[model samples]
Structures are given as structure tokens and as C-alpha cells.
Target: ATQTVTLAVPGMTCAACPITVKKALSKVEGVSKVDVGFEKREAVVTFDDTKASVQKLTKATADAGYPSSVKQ
Candidate 1:
């Protein structure tokens, strides 16, 4: 099974923001894909847990200037 995580992002203002967020997520080692919604201010990422963790993913977002939190 695939490990999926949804992240709530803040500070996204335009369509391009989500793209930036996705790009940042893609940089992570285990991230297979990233789907971000500009309007929803969220991102859904599919990744391999063995190669990455939630903290790493969220930190990547922060490193890109967009802080993110895992959605409950």
C-alpha cells in the first residue's frame, strides 16, 4: 500500500504557490508525487515511508518558505 499524507499549508496566494509547494515536496527523497490545491491551501503527497517521514516532508516545505502541518 502507498503511504499518503495531507498537509495544510499557509501563505499561498496564487496558483503558482501550489506549484512551488509541489516542487519543494518533489525534492524530498521518497516523495513519489505531490498534489497541492491553491484554493484549499493543502497538499496531498504520496511517498515511501522507509525513505522519508512526515517531519522531513514538513521541514522541506518550511525550507522552501512555506510552513506546513499534517492534517488530522
Candidate 2:
């Protein structure tokens, strides 16, 4: 099944940061789409639950220098 995940980010300071983060997530396998909000400091990702994991998404963001935590 497909799922949506929302993560809270703490260090995004500019619009470019969200763009960069979205780009990184788009490159991840099984990620269908990514929407990032600079004002909200959050990222919403649509992905195939069977093909991807939360850790993978989080790691991809971290690789882009914007680590995030899954909202509970």
C-alpha cells in the first residue's frame, strides 16, 4: 500500500533548503512525490510502503543536510 509521511524539520532557514530537500527525496526509490514547506518546516512524502522505509527517507533528507523526525 502507498503511504504518506510528514516530517518536522528544525534547520530549514530559506526557500532553497526545501527545494533541495525535495530534490533529494525525489531521487529516492519508491518515492512517488515530495512536497516541502519552508514556512511549516515540514516535508510530506508519498511513497510505496512496501518499496520504501521511513529510515530511508529520513536518511535521504540527512544526506541533503536537512535531517528530520517523523511526526507522531
Candidate 3:
């Protein structure tokens, strides 16, 4: 039971990406990097579907206090 609709990006400080993504989601090694409209407060997550479940993804964000949702 969580919903905040946070805007999460998948780039590394606008550099290599994935790195920043992994920062919050270090649970799995599948995170590989968002789109704009980004001003909309949402992130299009890109990680291993199997390991990076919506549960884990959102939970990871929640852990960081971002309560996110991977572009449903």
C-alpha cells in the first residue's frame, strides 16, 4: 500500500546513467536507466523485469523516501 507517483530518472548525474539508478535501487544488478515530461513527476524505470518487480522498484524508492512507480 504505497502511492506517491515520484519522478525518478535513470541516468548517472546526466552522465553514464544506471549508476544513479543503482544508487537508489541497488537491490539488483539489472538497473540500466527517464524521459522528460519528466516535469510530470514520474520516471520510466529500466531494470531486469524479473528481479526488479514493481514491488521492489516502488519499495526501493520508498526506502529513499521517493515513493515511486515505474511508468505503469
Candidate 4:
């Protein structure tokens, strides 16, 4: 099933941060779209749950040097 999630990425502090985060999330197998906001410090991701988990999504951001957590 397809799922959408918003993650808080507090580590992004520059104009290019969103680009990096979006690229990282987009590389995930199940990810169909990624919208990152540097001002909001968040990323909205659309992906297939069957192929990717929230853990994997967050891990991808972390590996890209932008650790994140699901928004409450």
C-alpha cells in the first residue's frame, strides 16, 4: 500500500538542505515523491509501504547526514 509521511528533519540548516534530503528520499525503492522544506525543517514523502518502511525512510535521511523522525 502507498503511504505518506511527514518527517521532522532538524539538521537541515541551509538552502541546499532540501535538495539533498529530497534526493536521498527519492532514491528509496518505494518512494514516489519527496517534498522537503528547509524553513519548516520537514520532509513529506510518498512511498509504498510494502517496499519501504518509515524506518528505512528515516535511515536514508540519516545516511545522507540529515537525521529525521516522524512528525507527531
Candidate 5:
């Protein structure tokens, strides 16, 4: 099944920042959708639960230089 998570990215400071986050998430295995909000400092991602998890999602952004965490 596909899982969706809203990640809070507080490090994005410009329009281009979303690009990095998007690319990072897109490169992760099983990721189906990546919607990053520059102003809102958030991203909603959809991926296959069997191949991906929330930890991977957070690491993807963290490795891309935009640290993120699951929003409560």
C-alpha cells in the first residue's frame, strides 16, 4: 500500500530549496509523489510502504541539506 507523510522542512529559505528536496525525495525508492511547499516549509510525500518508510523520507531530505521531520 502507498503511504503519505507530511514532513516539516524548516531549512528551506528560497524557491530553489524545494527543488533539492523534490529531487532527493524522487530519488528515494518507492516514492510516488513529492509536493514541496516553499513558503509553508513543508512537503507531502507519497510512497510505497513496503519499500520506503518515514525514516528514509527524513534522511532523503537531510542528505540533500534540508533537514526534515514528520509533522505531528
Candidate 6:
């Protein structure tokens, strides 16, 4: 099934941060949509649970140099 998650990405400090975060998340096999907010330092991702999970999403951001955690 497809699932959506909101993540708090505190490491996003500039305009380009969201781009990197989005790109990283998008590269994940199951990620279908990614919306990153630089001001809010958050990312909303929609992905397939069958192929990915919240943990994978967070790790992807972390590996991109922007560590994240589940927002709620």
C-alpha cells in the first residue's frame, strides 16, 4: 500500500536544502512524491509501503547530509 509521511528535517538551512532532500527521497524506489519546505524544515513524502518505509525515508535524508525524524 501507499503511505504518506511528514518528516522534520532540521538540517535544511537554505533554499537548496529542499532540492537535495527532495532528490534524495525521490531516488528511493518507492517514493512517488516529495514536498519539502525550507522555512518549515519539513518534508511530506508519498511512497509505497511495500517497497519503502518511514525509516528508509529518514535514512535517505540523513545520507544526503540532512538528518530527519518523523513529524508525528
Query: Who wins the TM-score comparison?
Result: 6
Report the lDDT tens digits of candidate 1 across residue range 6-51.
Answer: 7776857467765576776678668888887875667778888788
User: How close is every model to the real structure, measured as TM-score?
Assistant: 0.80, 0.79, 0.44, 0.84, 0.83, 0.85
Worst 10 residues of 5 by lDDT: 13-22
| Alpha-carbon lDDT, every model | 0.71, 0.71, 0.44, 0.75, 0.76, 0.77
**Model 4 lDDT tens row, 1-72:** 688888777777677775577777787668878887765767788888889866667767876888877752
List the lowest-lDDT window of 10 residues for candidate 2.
53-62
Query: How many steric clashes between backbone atoms does each model show?
Result: 0, 0, 3, 0, 0, 0
Between prediction 2 and prediction 3, the one with superior TM-score is: 2
Rank all candidate structures by their TM-score, best first, as comma-separated numbers: 6, 4, 5, 1, 2, 3
Off by over 4 Å in 3: 1-29, 34-39
Candidate 5 per-residue C-alpha lDDT over 1-72 given as tens digits, one digit per residue, 9 for 90 to 100: 688888876768577775677776777778889887775767778898789876677778877888878752
lDDT by residue (tens digit), candidate 3, 1-72: 322232354322333333333355554334445222322434445556555655566556456444555545
TM-score of predicted model 3?
0.44
Model 6 CA lDDT for position 16: 83
List the lowest-lDDT window of 10 residues for candidate 1.
11-20
The runs of at least 3 residues in candidate 1 whose Cα sits more than 4 Å from the true structure, single-residue gaps closed, are none
Query: What is the total number of backbone clashes in candidate 3?
Result: 3
As a TM-score, model 4 comes out at 0.84
Ranking by lDDT: 6, 5, 4, 1, 2, 3
Q: After superposition, how far is residue 67 of candidate 6 from its true place, in Å?
A: 1.0
Candidate 6: list runs displaced more than 4 Å. none
Report residue 16 deviation for candidate 3 (angstroms): 19
Which candidate has the top score in lDDT?
Answer: 6
- Model 4, position 43: C-alpha lDDT score: 75
